[PDB]
Design a binder for this molecule. Structure first.
Ligand SMILES: COc1cc(OC)c(/C=C/S(=O)(=O)Cc2ccc(OC)c(NCC(=O)O)c2)c(OC)c1
Length: 82
């Protein structure tokens, strides 16, 4: 059976969108869909994932195919020009 890897990203506002683990693709591109589907932007959003009872912040250049099997969650970095 064709193996399907995904990462379930918990979007802002406690929603979630899953993105198929893209090999050779960064959190940037994968999450780019994730945010954009909600109408949000990866610019003012951060990627975190919970490890041993704690939080580990993720880098946008991180190959998302390592993060397969995990549930992610994005943290809104509110630094708007307001
Ligand atoms: C890899 O194989 C897939 C098969 C799919 O289908 C057969 C979808 C399908 C996606 S989709 O068209 O359902 C848009 C989508 C997906 C998940 C969501 O939450 C978990 C939301 N949440 C939106 C909200 O709640 O605001 C939106 C896929 O997506 C990556 C992957």
């Amino acid at each position: 059976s064709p193996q399907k890897p995904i990462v379930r990203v918990f979007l802002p506002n406690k929603q979630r969108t899953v993105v198929p683990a893209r090999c050779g693709v960064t959190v940037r591109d994968s999450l780019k869909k994730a945010l954009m589907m909600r109408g949000l932007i990866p610019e003012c959003c951060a990627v975190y994932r919970i490890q041993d009872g704690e939080k580990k912040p993720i880098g946008w250049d991180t190959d998302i195919s390592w993060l397969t099997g995990e549930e992610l969650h994005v943290e809104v970095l509110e630094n708007v020009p307001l």
